Amino acid sequence: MAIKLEDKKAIVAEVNEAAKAALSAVVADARGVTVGAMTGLRKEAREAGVYVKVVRNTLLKRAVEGTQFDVLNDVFKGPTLIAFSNEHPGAAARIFREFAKGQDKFEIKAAAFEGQFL
């Protein structure tokens, strides 16, 4: 368990720091994916440009204070697979179409292209 000192009060800020650099964000219920299948997906953020990660739900809701994806407060529940797209505005939800094409998972809760509640 992360303590409030070593982490849990710094990694909350880092995603908020990286929040104010992106144009799109697709949140998916990434539960049940194999380590290789995620790795195959994880070998795409370095190619097309993405900030895909998973964080605590409560920290994520407290990480939007920078006014980047405030429209996701009502959807900040369940599993999280935040996929901030900074370079090449968008271009990740298209990969999500490729990512969810071969899987039954990736329900994809919402997309945050600019100010937009999906």
Add this chain to the structure above:
Amino acid sequence: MKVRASVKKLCRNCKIIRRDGIVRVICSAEPRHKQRQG
């Protein structure tokens, strides 16, 4: 059943219970870990 003056856990599945004034060990993995008295 093993009856000893010193009864205790032998694995992570063993439980200490008090059943009608007697200390017992019941295990759901090995039936060799059953114990009485102590």
Add this chain to the structure above:
Amino acid sequence: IKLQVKAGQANPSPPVGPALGQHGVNIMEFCKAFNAKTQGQEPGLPTPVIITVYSDRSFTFETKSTPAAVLLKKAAGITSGSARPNSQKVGTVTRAQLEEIAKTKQADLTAADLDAAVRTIAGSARSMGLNVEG
């Protein structure tokens, strides 16, 4: 179904423990792919390639170019590792043969991004003596 096939010859069952296993793949079936597994598929060495079944006893073969110790032995030429770590050394080279080895070895079998496979490739030989400084 993780397994191994001898390059250029699949008939030997004791060499691979064929027949009995997770699936029922034919022993003589893999002999055809053994021709494809030669020269560039670790000739003379037991390259391990896993197996899979499509419907019943398929011939789904794999490919592993060069393992880290296989590459380390190829890059060093030594005969064996050290039985006692941090006690015996055999001799190593600079951290430059690893870059060309990892570039060939990783390909898609490693998730390393940049100089990340350098630690992974050196990891297998890290405890086998032959300390490296440059």
Add this chain to the structure above:
Amino acid sequence: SRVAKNPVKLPAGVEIKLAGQQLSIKGAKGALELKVHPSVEVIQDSGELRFAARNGDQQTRAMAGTTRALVNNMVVGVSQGFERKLQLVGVGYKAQAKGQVLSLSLGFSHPVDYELPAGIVAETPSQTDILIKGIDKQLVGQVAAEIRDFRPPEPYKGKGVRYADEVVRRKEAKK
């Protein structure tokens, strides 16, 4: 007391009568669930049913969670009939349901006849499956445990009557 503070939240069609500590619940497909609560118990009636302890005694705390569990069983029972599944493993093992008598073949010289007490009924969709089905858990579970005790499972072949959800330990003779 997490179990005690939890309300029952009775379903739509259920009839509840509270003549003091004694309680009676009516429902579909079975009724007349009579119970008595120990004098240390308060059953307060509202949009649902709640349970609380009068005293601060340690035994009174224990019985608060027992009454909540018991009442929740009566409510579910008169709305969904509790059931247990048994299955027979072994060659020549058969179960036949004939009204209120159950006949089992379990490898004895004599077939055994089991008399079902009033209330529950037994059903055998196959020759190796038994469905005990009633409205109160204690009677359903006691009857299923009595059938199982005719020949419980054994470790070498797994033969004998067992619960459907039961995990049977298995072993083999050495060498």
Add this chain to the structure above:
RNA sequence: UGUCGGCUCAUCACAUCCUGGGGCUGAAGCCGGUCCCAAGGGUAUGGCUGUUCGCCAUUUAAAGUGGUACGCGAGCUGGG
């Protein structure tokens, strides 16, 4: 206040030899090992030796271990 052994007649405990009920087993079955509960009833004949014991022969479901003035001579014997 008569001291070993035998005969006759016993009575009690349970730390159970058989029969009864169980758990574990390195318990397939038939046999076993070990521990728990249980004292209702049972529990050899002989060769040698004064012997109790012991060793042998052949039985039996089994041939229990101890207390009772190492039970019992105003009940017998008299080999030591």
Add this chain to the structure above:
RNA sequence: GGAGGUUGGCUUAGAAGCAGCCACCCUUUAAAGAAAGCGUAAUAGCUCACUAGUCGAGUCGGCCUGCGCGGAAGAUGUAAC
């Protein structure tokens, strides 16, 4: 979910995180020890340690001390107020 270098090396036909001896890295991240248990002849296969969601208020262990429980079986009759 609980991964790849990586059947770690030595030896062993082979002993592959789980035959014995040396120290016990690093990429991906949410996680992972050259791996704690049961395992295969050896593989393989169920776990666990660690982490994500879920339900929403307490919960975990140690120390000092009062009174109690087990350990606790005998011979005529309860018979160790």
